[PDB]
Design a protein around this ligand. Structure first.
Ligand SMILES: Nc1ncnc2c1ncn2[C@@H]1O[C@H](COP(=O)(O)OP(=O)(O)O)[C@@H](O)[C@H]1O
Ligand SMILES: Nc1ncnc2c1ncn2[C@@H]1O[C@H](COP(=O)(O)OP(=O)(O)O)[C@@H](O)[C@H]1O
Ligand SMILES: [Mg+2]
Ligand SMILES: [Mg+2]
Lengths: 81, 371, 293, 186
């Protein structure tokens, strides 16, 4: 057997925190001895993983203090009064 | 001396002789009164038609139910129901046969007082009894213990009984049953343009609900199936000759029983009502009640109710205990069948409320004698 | 509403055309003590004067060994329901284990997630990880990006949409996963041990049963034919559960996860939720590509 | 631009601009077609008269209401009402103007489907809305809660609204309004 590839990225990335499986637990006929994931290896994939996982009518009104529902029912009331 | 069992429910009066297997007289409890102007002289035009004659001539009558939400409101109308089911349906004199009567749980006591007073003064029997409908529904299930979800036309109540002892604090009552489903079907049939507003149209909508409606297993999958293709549509022929076709409203009509927010009721569904009624009991007796879900009444006659009930209770309860639903096909008359079982017993001869006990204690010994 | 001698004749014949499960269930649940049955059997001379329940106890008191006989009859009428509850649980686990065993497009997804995830976990405790758990795959959606607009589930679905367009047919290969998402292995072992104990109790009943003094008494022939049929069906069920335990230990070796750290129902609920999350992630990536157009 | 409020009621169409105190064009929704023999050639004899022109010449016309009990029966007549209230009365271009519409509660849904289809294809507005009439009456009264008894020409409905939420289950519709009173007076 061989150990896994110790990658050293330039930027610390966000990671999923799984419960990892060491090589001492591995059986002979398992899936993870037969993993050949280096055929999926791409520097473009690592670059993307580093980059991602590092008017005729004026009717808008600015509400600095009031919320949306209180200003709506006030303008209903002021339009009626 | 054959006794009489007479379930005076909200839906239909079911009356007959004790010791039998099917009730002799099943007829709806309505009183029809004429509303138009009578123009033909003679021929015996009655001012009030009671029972099936009001159903047959329903196009000129206003129909009044004497029982609303399980409580007898009108009393002369209920006396006309009792006179028609004694003198016309069974055709027997009531003062020679003892009579068993059914009553909803959590009743106001003056209903029982006036029922005892009417049955001991107007139709004065030598002996009578007033029984709970859920106890008679559990007696006709071939057992003694279990929980009964009895859903008539107005009252849907869960009553658990363990070893013949009816637990009073765990009795739960929801006012959502087949009349409210019929009114909700009248509400949603106007979405397709078929207006029904009269009391005579409510019988046609109730016939549609009896013949075409069914309980879905999944609500969202059946709604997506009806929205996707028109394979669930069914046709109905009206008595004037018109033909209507309905789609998703076959299963949205009994979906109010499992989602009571459709007609604006704050309480939860009947599976959650059953779960809270079992969880109000002791922790040691819950395993017997998980496997003894007995259903009764005409509202539980849908051909989809048992699988949905078992799925909802299995999603509610923990999976360590077995969930079983008891749904006999004779559950429409199961209250009458349990009354015929209880009335013919030799142990029931000492439990009769006689004429002398009424003369001694007034019409108030039925509170202290029965449960 | 049956006559009491007819109930005795159905019991003594083991009349399977008349006998049902709920009848014997209601007979056992209302049966009194055999001391009360023997006390009713002492008063057979006054049979017309006793009660209807008491006349039932006189007739039932003549039948000997009544409480282990009725429990053997109860286990006989519940054996067909107990096989039909235990066996489709075992078939659902075995078919889900065999579908996950070959599973070549999902195995290429497992190689792809481990390569991307070891680059993400580089410098951490999980650096150089030889494997990761299949039940953790719901939390690929919880691994979000820096802008919090796409997930690791959304990144791997977009990578399989771009680079390798054969990985995406994995979740239709998972067929018996949702059926195996509610199956408990300890409840299957407890029910099979209860089945093994009750078959030994019926076979002890069969061997301790005396000779039939009546031609109607077909208890000896019918119950021994049941014991020959039930031991055959339990050995079919024990071989299939041993095949289920071998395939669970094989996938315990294959995914290098411990058999005690997770049961069967939380195993395949996470696999069914990974099926629904990946189907959402492809539909969200197709919606995001149509939004950008 | 300025939005259009066009209450297409059963008896009277009331149309006008947004933010105005009074509706600009109030006219009854009738379609008049002649039933006698036209003997004079020329003279601008149209085959149909819509609105006040059918009211002025009603002695030689058969008048049909396109809306009966809140349900639009005749749809080409309803398109003639919409074309008359867009081009003749209001005199605007509806392709550059939002147009709100009203609807009675407990309506069939296909009426709203065909209203949406006509307002988005034949009379293709940039935007539109379908609103409940009792919510608009409670907005015009100024209060947020309350129960509105709205009775137009075909639909008499009681709708209660609490805190701006229109409660669906207590909406009570009775088909008894001013056309039934007109026929009873006749
Ligand atoms: N096949 C059916 N499907 C759905 N509902 C039914 C069916 N048969 C009867 N019902 C409903 O059950 C009601 C009758 O229930 P019933 O047992 O008479 O109650 P109660 O005795 O309290 O009046 C009827 O009102 C009817 O609407
Ligand atoms: N002053 C009044 N008194 C009584 N009824 C009236 C009066 N004015 C109008 N109406 C009735 O109200 C109806 C008009 O109601 P309206 O809401 O304008 O209908 P719509 O908007 O549907 O055309 C007419 O049919 C008329 O019969
Ligand atoms: Mg009833
Ligand atoms: Mg109006």
């Amino acid at each position: 057997l061989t150990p896994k590839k110790v990658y050293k990225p330039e930027v610390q990335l966000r990671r999923p925190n799984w419960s990892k499986f060491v090589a001492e637990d591995l059986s002979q006929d398992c899936f993870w001895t037969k993993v050949k994931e280096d055929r999926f290896e791409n520097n473009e994939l690592f670059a993307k993983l580093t980059l991602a996982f590092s008017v005729q009518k004026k009717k808008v009104k600015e509400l600095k203090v009031l919320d949306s529902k209180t200003a709506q029912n006030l303008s209903i009331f002021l339009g009626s009064f | 001396t054959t006794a009489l069992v007479c379930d005076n429910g909200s839906g239909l009066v079911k009356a007959g002789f004790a010791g039998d297997d099917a009730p002799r007289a099943v007829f709806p409890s309505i009183v029809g009164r004429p509303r138009h102007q009578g123009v033909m002289v003679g021929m015996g035009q009655k001012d009030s038609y009671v029972g099936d004659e009001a159903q047959s001539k329903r196009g000129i009558l206003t129909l009044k139910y004497p029982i609303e939400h399980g409580i007898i409101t009108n009393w002369d109308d209920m006396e006309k129901i009792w006179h028609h089911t004694f003198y016309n349906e069974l055709r027997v004199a009531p003062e020679e046969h003892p009579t068993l009567l059914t009553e909803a749980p959590l009743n106001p006591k003056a209903n029982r007082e006036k029922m005892t007073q009417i049955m001991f003064e107007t139709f004065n029997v030598p002996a009578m009894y007033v029984a709970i409908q859920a106890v008679l529904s559990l007696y006709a299930s071939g057992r003694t213990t279990g929980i009964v979800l009895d859903s008539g036309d107005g009252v849907t109540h869960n009553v658990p009984i363990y070893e013949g002892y009816a637990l009073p604090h765990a009795i739960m009552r929801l006012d959502l049953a087949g009349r409210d489903l019929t009114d909700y079907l009248m509400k949603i049939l106007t979405e397709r343009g078929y207006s029904f507003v009269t009391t005579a149209e409510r019988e046609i909508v109730r016939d549609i609900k009896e013949k075409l409606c069914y309980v879905a297993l999944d609500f969202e999958n059946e709604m997506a199936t009806a929205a996707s293709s028109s394979s669930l549509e069914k046709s109905y022929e009206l008595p004037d000759g018109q033909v209507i076709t309905i789609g998703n409203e076959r299963f949205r009509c009994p979906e109010t029983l499992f989602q009571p927010s459709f007609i604006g009721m704050e309480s939860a569904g009947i599976h959650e009502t059953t779960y809270n009624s079992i969880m109000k009991c002791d922790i040691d007796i819950r395993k017997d009640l998980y496997a003894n879900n007995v259903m009764s009444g005409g509202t539980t006659m849908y051909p989809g109710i048992a699988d949905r009930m078992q799925k909802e209770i299995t999603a509610l309860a923990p999976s360590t205990m077995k969930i079983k639903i008891i749904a006999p096909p004779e559950r429409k008359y199961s209250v009458w069948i349990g009354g015929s079982i209880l009335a013919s017993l030799s142990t029931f001869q000492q439990m009769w409320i006689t004429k002398q006990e009424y003369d001694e204690a007034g019409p108030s010994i039925v509170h202290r004698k029965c449960f | 509403r049956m006559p009491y001698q007819e109930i005795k004749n159905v019991i003594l014949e083991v009349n399977e055309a008349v006998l049902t499960e709920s009848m014997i269930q209601n007979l056992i649940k209302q049966m009194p003590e055999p001391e009360q049955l023997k006390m009713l059997s002492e008063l057979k001379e006054e049979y017309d004067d006793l009660a209807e329940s008491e006349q039932f106890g006189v007739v039932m008191g003549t039948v000997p060994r009544l409480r282990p006989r009725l429990n053997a009859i109860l286990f006989k009428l519940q054996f067909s329901e107990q096989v039909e509850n235990i066996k489709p649980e075992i078939v659902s686990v075995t078919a889900a284990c065999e579908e996950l065993r070959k599973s070549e497009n999902f195995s290429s997804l497992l190689e792809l997630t481990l390569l991307v995830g070891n680059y993400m976990n580089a410098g951490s405790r999980n650096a150089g990880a030889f494997g990761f758990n299949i039940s953790f795959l719901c939390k690929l959606r919880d691994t979000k990006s820096a802008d919090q607009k796409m997930t690791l589930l959304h990144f791997l679905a977009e990578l399989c949409e771009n680079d390798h367009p054969e990985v995406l047919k994995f979740p239709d290969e998972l067929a018996h996963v949702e059926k195996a998402s509610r199956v408990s292995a300890e409840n299957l072992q407890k029910s099979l041990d209860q089945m093994k104990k009750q078959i030994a109790d019926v076979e002890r009943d069969v061997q301790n049963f005396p000779a039939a003094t009546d031609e109607k008494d077909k208890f000896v022939e019918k119950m021994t034919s049941f014991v020959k049929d039930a031991q055959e069906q339990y050995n079919k069920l024990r071989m299939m559960h041993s095949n289920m335990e071998t395939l669970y230990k094989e996938l315990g070796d294959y995914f290098v996860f411990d058999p005690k750290k997770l049961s069967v129902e939380e195993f395949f609920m996470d696999l069914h939720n990974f099926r629904n999350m990946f189907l959402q992630a492809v539909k969200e990536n197709q919606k995001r590509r149509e939004t950008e157009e």
